[PDB]
């Protein structure tokens, strides 16, 4: 229940083929993050599909065109319509085998840069080869990039489009090699096919979680430790290991899907025989799967709420893990105190929440205390503190959703060093309030680093 | 003319789903209303081709070959010389396709309707299957809702749900076209318009806006009526109110087309003919954009919530102008000024655009109606308002007076709606002009 | 270097909305960066309507060419032997997009020659084609004429509101296929699109290229509609908007010029250079780590620049536009709304690899924020934030023609700073991009 009261720093991510950031307190800016992301991925697809179909088939099986041509290219009637529990089957399955596959790449890399140099294959010694000739074009990237900043900046670190930033940072392209606008990742492969698509399209149950970031923060971070000097093997693990986190993070989702909640609709298809008209053991109904339906605001991704007093200065995070771990925190702001609250909480009861012991506060109970400890603070004026005392007994206005790249632990992490690391704090709140807001949600996403 | 007080200083809902469902705005910002109508319209394109793939032969089958005949000249072909298009015939085409699309549309939801209100016993085989599947899906939407209000903190403002397109059509699409229950292949009335760009086409030929001829996501009404009914089974009467509340729509669309084919259609061939000698390589199967500017509406005249804002730098002053379709050309003015706790609602005069119907000459102008608003809000300080740009509503404009009605007169809803950042309160309004909002 | 006072009837930007280019609040990073993704997105979805009606056409007059590049971007990926050279793939897609610019400035210069060709001397097809360019003209009237008087007393916005399609059909003096059919108007700006020839330029060496582009619409076109109420436009001043954008095509043209003549032998020489630097070198292969030498930090692309106050203030933003690489020049424009300021000033060339060499005059960036800080700081030395960029579509000259009445047209000045300061920024944008007249 941390209370903790608030040169060049930047923002580990690139602009432009990077995730995106918003501004906390406008709902509508983390609104249309969401819908330009779909309607990229769903562009990019295209030429992934086109470019690559064979290639698919031949590695993932043909499963993956079955999910794709299901979504968007055939439907079936009568004798020849679709089992959808066979169809949510194979989604799910096709995504675990995409994602275990990303995951096999990237601990072969790994364990080839932790493993001497005399130890090394000739393969080993080729791939690590490959990846520092990469490492190299980021570095050179970066290092142009920094002595172009102001004295005293805020900023992103580089700024490179989507298949500039594929040709220089993937670690393991899937296909596409070293040809630009060819590059096929599996993040690329997954949406190209429509594998959460479809899993979302039958089920009700949103996996924008279930994804991984375009660029590894600890990757960026080392290639700044080692200024012109060669990044250490050993260092680019760190971003490696950060990736299968998230990678193996995904795994654990899929399989807690595959495990305890697709057992589950089957049997309340079955169970819901004679409550639907025309019930077919084919086909799952809405009503059927609306056991599983978690409310909106305990999805796993950075929620955010405002206070219920006019103030631009204070936003709540609730950042809620994949069902696995069902976990969650409170990351509470007050810019005009210079306040940050942090605390664990309690693990919600939602039909898709893996029961962990029943531990840690209730949000609710949470943002008491944070309006309370508000109203405490020696620097809040006799108007705020009453703000704070009103908003306290109230509760406060949910706004949105934005979705989260890294792995939970990571977002932890992240939030960790906004409320601990008191160098960070004093870098982030310069500027237009507005901007300082952005640069809070950057932190907390991707993570500043100080020079 | 009603001029109240907004009191300021319970749980509502916005009575709309997110993801899926329409977007809202803050008034305020002329980028985020720009983007919503840019979002839209991407979003459209990506799902047309979904339903052209899955659907073209039975699309052809049910509406004709003109559907295709009228997105083949619109993204596929271009014929040149002897075989060159009667753009005339094209736009005859798209028109009678769109309306053609919307009768289908009205006619299956009269036919639910009608069968919710009829005795059960009364009620054929089929008329019980399908109110039967129309049930399933609400009950699919109560549960829904259900799970969704114990989530809710004691005091919350919001909307009430929050599915994905895909999910929401699933659940709340009364009467799917083709699609049936099979997830993304559900195809609406207002889905095969898009594919097809009936409207796309009309308005490329002519330049008339036609945003407005089109229908909400999810109703209104039929939100309420689940939130009425707490796990209580909705009454088959109370589902007719969603269910009425869209017909309304189809109607007005209906009779909005049907204005544009029997009094602007004729005068557009008109003015073909007239400008025979104005025009170089004159052709009698072109539309020239010279011979159609007769019939622009200025872009603030255009069906659609106008906002405006304050001559003078202030976040707590916003009008809207919400414009009716052509055929019924009324319009009313809602001015807000929220560091007053004051709402203005006026009813006004009829616009002398080509594409307005003639009416009787009732109501003040625009004009007249900022005069009044500007002079109570500069106290708190003649000024002419600063326009900021358009934003598309889905209701009927009748179901949009009403939620305009409720913001001047409901002073229950006055107190749960400005609570948060202000700017936040903006939205809200936004949205309960747009949907309403319930108080619980 | 230029410090006034901004002082302060109907005053209207110089661009149609929908149809038209989009502006921005310079202090939302956010609003920015969604004009150039939407920007984007739509461009694609318009790229495969001309794709599909004109592949044989564009094909007939540009070459196959332009479809191979299309067709390396999007469609096919060779592999091993096949494998596609990548520098013959950078030199295609160099080449189709200048061959596509000069035909769009060929057909400009000969509408421009007979516009200025007394009425007698103009030959049957001069005369024609003047005929069909005046008739979209008229269109063009008429629209602003019923958009004027639906104006309230005391407006300041965009002069008129129309559709991509519609905008094209009235708008576009030479499109090279489509004629008079809506959905089907191909003008140069779509062919490129279409085909990809930036994206692969782009996507093979690192190089941003969002500035060679063409508006939708030219300003000074409508501002000689206004300048003619009712009153048929001259042949004369016509040509004003018609020179407009010859000039941003010939900038276009010395830009890929530049890139041809100057960048193309370097990473050519930078390829052959990293052979033993790069493990499985091909000389068919541009590595990402040999392009490198070409990268311009993201501050110094030519685009207007947008920079916000080091401390909470909504009335100071900072543009730093920068021109074509090869003229390499920039300004700065600044604004304190607070205190009614603008700053401008010429500033000095950069020294990023793609930068033409010029004479050593101009202060710095850092030197002239230090100024405009310490002036703003006083109603409150200083660095400023970033927030990000906003492509401009006009010629670098326009642009600063633009800024330059922004600083000394005193009667502008004061129908600019009216209503909201969200709004009032927007204005100030619009008026930097395309330009405000006062009636």
Redesign the interface.
């Known amino acids: 229940t941390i209370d903790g009261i608030i040169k060049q720093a930047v923002i580990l991510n690139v ?1 432009g083929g990077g995730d ?1 950031i ?2 906390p ?5 983390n ?2 993050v969401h ?2 992301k779909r ?2 991925d ?2 990019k697809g ?2 992934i599909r ?3 179909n064979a290639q698919v088939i031949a590695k993932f099986g043909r499963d993956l065109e079955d999910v794709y041509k ?6 079936k ?1 009568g004798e020849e ?2 089992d ?1 529990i066979q169809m949510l089957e194979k989604a799910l399955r096709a995504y675990g085998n995409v994602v275990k596959v990303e995951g096999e790449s990237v601990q072969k890399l790994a364990k080839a840069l932790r493993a001497e140099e005399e130890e090394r294959t000739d393969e080993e010694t ?1 791939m690590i ?2 990846y ?3 490492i ?2 980021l570095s ?2 970066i290092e ?2 920094r ?2 900043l ?6 992103e670190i ?4 989507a ?2 930033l594929e ?2 940072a993937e670690e393991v392209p899937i ?8 590059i096929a990742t599996a993040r690329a492969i997954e949406g190209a096919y ?1 594998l959460k ?2 899993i ?3 089920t ?1 149950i ?1 996996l924008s979680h279930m994804t991984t970031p375009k660029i590894q923060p600890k990757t960026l971070e080392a290639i700044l430790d080692a200024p012109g000097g060669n990044v250490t093997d050993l260092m680019l693990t760190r971003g490696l290991d950060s990736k299968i986190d998230k990678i193996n993070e995904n795994l654990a989702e899929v399989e807690h899907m595959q495990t305890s909640i697709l057992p589950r609709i089957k049997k309340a298809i079955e169970e819901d025989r004679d ?4 019930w ?1 053991p084919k ?5 059927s ?3 599983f ?1 978690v ?4 999805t796993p991704s950075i929620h955010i709420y ?7 200065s204070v936003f709540i995070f609730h950042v809620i893990s994949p069902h696995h771990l069902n976990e969650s925190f409170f990351l509470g702001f007050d810019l005009e105190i210079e306040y940050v609250h942090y605390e664990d909480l309690a693990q919600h009861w939602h039909s898709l929440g893996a029961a962990q012991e029943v531990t840690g506060r209730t949000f ?1 109970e949470a943002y008491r205390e944070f309006f309370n400890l508000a109203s405490r603070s020696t620097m809040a004026s006799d108007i705020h503190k009453k703000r704070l005392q009103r908003s306290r007994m ?7 959703v934005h979705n989260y790249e890294l792995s939970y632990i990571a977002i932890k992490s992240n939030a960790m060093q906004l409320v601990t690391d008191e160098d960070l704090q004093k870098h982030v709140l ?7 807001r ?1 640069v809070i949600m950057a932190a907390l996403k991707y993570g500043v680093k100080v020079m």
């Open positions: 602009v995106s918003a501004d307190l406008s709902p509508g800016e609104d249309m819908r330009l309607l990229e769903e562009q295209e030429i086109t470019k690559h299901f979504a968007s290219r055939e439907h009637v319509e679709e959808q080729r080869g490959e520092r000739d990469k190299d074009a050179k990237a142009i990039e002595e172009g102001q004295d005293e900046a805020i900023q580089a700024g490179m489009s298949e500039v040709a220089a296909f596409g090699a070293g040809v630009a606008t060819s429509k698509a479809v979302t399209a039958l009700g949103d409550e639907i008209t025309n077919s086909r799952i109904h809405p009503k799967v609306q056991r339906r409310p909106r605001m305990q405002a206070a219920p007093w006019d103030s631009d609710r109230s509760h406060p206005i949910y706004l949105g310069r500027g237009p309030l507005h901007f300082q952005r």
